[PDB]
Design a protein around this motif. Structure first.
Motif, short mmCIF file in Angstrom:
data_model
loop_
_atom_site.label_atom_id
_atom_site.label_comp_id
_atom_site.label_asym_id
_atom_site.label_seq_id
_atom_site.Cartn_x
_atom_site.Cartn_y
_atom_site.Cartn_z
N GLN A 59 0.86 -1.13 0.02
CA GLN A 59 0.03 0.12 0.04
C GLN A 59 0.91 1.29 -0.05
N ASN A 60 2.32 1.20 0.59
CA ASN A 60 3.14 2.31 0.70
C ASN A 60 4.39 1.89 1.15
N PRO A 61 5.06 1.28 -0.04
CA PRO A 61 6.58 0.93 0.14
C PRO A 61 7.44 1.91 0.95
N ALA A 62 6.59 3.11 1.42
CA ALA A 62 7.56 3.90 2.17
C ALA A 62 7.61 3.75 3.65
N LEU A 63 6.78 2.69 3.87
CA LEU A 63 6.88 2.26 5.40
C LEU A 63 7.90 1.00 5.36
N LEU A 64 8.51 0.86 4.34
CA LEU A 64 9.56 -0.29 4.53
C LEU A 64 10.45 -0.03 5.37
N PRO A 65 11.49 1.09 4.99
CA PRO A 65 12.57 1.79 5.71
C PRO A 65 12.58 1.39 7.05
N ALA A 66 11.13 1.65 7.95
CA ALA A 66 11.05 1.39 9.08
C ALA A 66 10.75 -0.06 9.33
N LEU A 67 10.16 -0.79 8.50
CA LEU A 67 9.63 -2.03 8.51
C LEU A 67 11.03 -3.12 8.51
N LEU A 68 11.48 -3.10 7.22
CA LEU A 68 12.74 -3.78 7.01
C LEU A 68 13.54 -3.94 8.23
N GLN A 69 13.71 -2.70 9.08
CA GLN A 69 14.33 -2.71 9.90
C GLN A 69 14.06 -3.60 11.22
N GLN A 70 12.87 -3.43 11.58
CA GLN A 70 12.06 -4.25 12.56
C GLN A 70 12.20 -5.73 12.12
N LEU A 71 12.33 -5.98 10.66
CA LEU A 71 12.30 -7.30 10.52
C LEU A 71 13.76 -7.77 10.65
N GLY A 72 14.70 -7.08 10.46
CA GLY A 72 16.25 -7.73 10.81
C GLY A 72 16.49 -7.60 12.13
N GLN A 73 15.66 -6.88 12.95
CA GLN A 73 15.76 -6.91 14.42
C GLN A 73 15.09 -8.04 15.11
N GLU A 74 14.14 -8.58 14.47
CA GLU A 74 13.54 -9.54 15.03
C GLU A 74 13.69 -11.01 14.45
N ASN A 75 13.78 -11.25 13.20
CA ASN A 75 14.14 -12.27 12.59
C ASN A 75 15.22 -12.16 11.71
N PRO A 76 16.56 -12.17 12.32
CA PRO A 76 17.73 -12.06 11.45
C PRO A 76 18.09 -12.91 10.33
N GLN A 77 17.37 -14.20 10.72
CA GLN A 77 17.75 -15.41 9.68
C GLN A 77 16.86 -15.19 8.39
N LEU A 78 15.60 -14.57 8.76
CA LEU A 78 14.95 -14.47 7.33
C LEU A 78 15.46 -13.33 6.82
N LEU A 79 15.66 -12.41 7.22
CA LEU A 79 16.43 -11.05 6.47
C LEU A 79 17.48 -11.54 5.83
N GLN A 80 18.09 -12.39 6.02
CA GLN A 80 19.29 -12.65 5.19
C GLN A 80 18.89 -13.52 3.86
N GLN A 81 17.69 -14.21 4.08
CA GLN A 81 16.91 -14.97 3.09
C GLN A 81 16.05 -13.77 1.96
N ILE A 82 15.22 -13.09 2.63
CA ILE A 82 14.51 -12.38 1.71
C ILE A 82 15.45 -11.29 1.02
N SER A 83 16.70 -11.22 1.43
CA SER A 83 17.75 -10.53 0.46
C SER A 83 18.10 -11.46 -0.60
N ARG A 84 18.20 -12.58 -0.37
CA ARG A 84 18.84 -13.50 -1.72
C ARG A 84 17.37 -14.21 -2.33
N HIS A 85 16.27 -13.68 -1.89
CA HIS A 85 15.32 -14.14 -2.83
C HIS A 85 14.15 -13.09 -3.07
#
Ligand code: ZN
Length: 173
Positions: free
Chosen positions: A88-114
Motif C-alpha cells: 500500500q505504501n513501500p514508504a513504510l519499508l525503511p522502518a519495517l525492513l528494520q524491525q524485520l532484521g531486528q526480530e528475524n535476522p535469519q529471514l532478513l538474510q533470506q529475503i535479501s537472497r530471494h
C-alpha cells in the motif's frame, strides 16, 4: 557450473522483474560500468545477478512507482503485515525492513537472497567501507538521501560512486 548457461535461464527472469522495477538509464550504466570493471569476464555478469537482487530490496523501501528458506515467511506476521502496508505504501519499508532484521535476522538474510520470490508474494496473493570509500558514500547522501540508503546503494552499484548517483536519482520518484 550453472552460472555459465543456467545464469542465462534464471537471469532472464531476474531482469524481467528488476528491469521492470529498475530505471532503464541505470540498467544501461550498471552493465556499462560493471562491464568495464571486470570486462568481458564471466565474473562481471555473475556479480550483476547478486547486485541486481540486493538492488530489488531497495526498490521496495524507496517506493515502487510501478502499479525455500523464505517460503516459510508466510508463517510470520511481518510478512502478512509488512506486505499489507508495503504494497500500500513501500514508504513504510525503511522502518519495517528494520524491525524485520531486528526480530528475524535469519529471514532478513533470506529475503535479501530471494527478492523476486519475495516480491511476487509481496506483489501478488500471499558496510566493509573505509575512510577512503566512506567519503564516497555520504557523497551521495548530501543529494537528499538517508545515510543507510547510501551504504546500500554504493555497495549495490559495486561501490561505483559514479553509478550510485544515477541509482539514487533513478530509484523511482
Ligand atoms: Zn516497481
Amino acid at each position: 557450473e550453472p552460472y555459465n548457461e543456467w545464469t542465462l535461464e534464471l537471469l532472464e527472469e531476474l531482469k524481467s522483474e528488476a528491469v521492470r522495477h529498475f530505471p532503464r538509464i541505470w540498467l544501461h550504466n550498471l552493465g556499462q560500468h560493471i562491464y568495464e570493471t571486470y570486462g568481458d569476464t564471466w565474473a562481471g555478469v555473475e556479480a550483476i545477478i547478486r547486485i541486481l537482487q540486493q538492488l530489488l530490496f531497495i526498490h521496495f523501501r524507496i517506493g515502487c512507482r510501478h502499479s525455500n528458506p523464505l517460503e516459510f515467511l508466510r508463517d510470520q506476521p511481518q510478512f502478512q503485515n509488512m506486505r499489507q502496508v508495503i504494497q500500500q505504501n513501500p514508504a513504510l519499508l525503511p522502518a519495517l525492513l528494520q524491525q524485520l532484521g531486528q526480530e528475524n535476522p535469519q529471514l532478513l538474510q533470506q529475503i535479501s537472497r530471494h527478492q523476486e520470490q519475495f516480491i511476487q508474494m509481496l506483489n501478488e496473493p500471499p558496510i566493509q567501507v573505509t575512510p577512503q570509500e566512506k567519503e564516497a558514500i555520504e557523497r551521495l547522501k548530501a543529494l537528499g538521501f538517508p545515510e543507510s540508503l547510501v551504504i546500500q546503494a554504493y555497495f549495490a552499484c559495486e561501490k561505483n560512486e559514479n553509478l550510485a548517483a544515477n541509482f539514487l536519482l533513478s530509484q523511482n520518484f
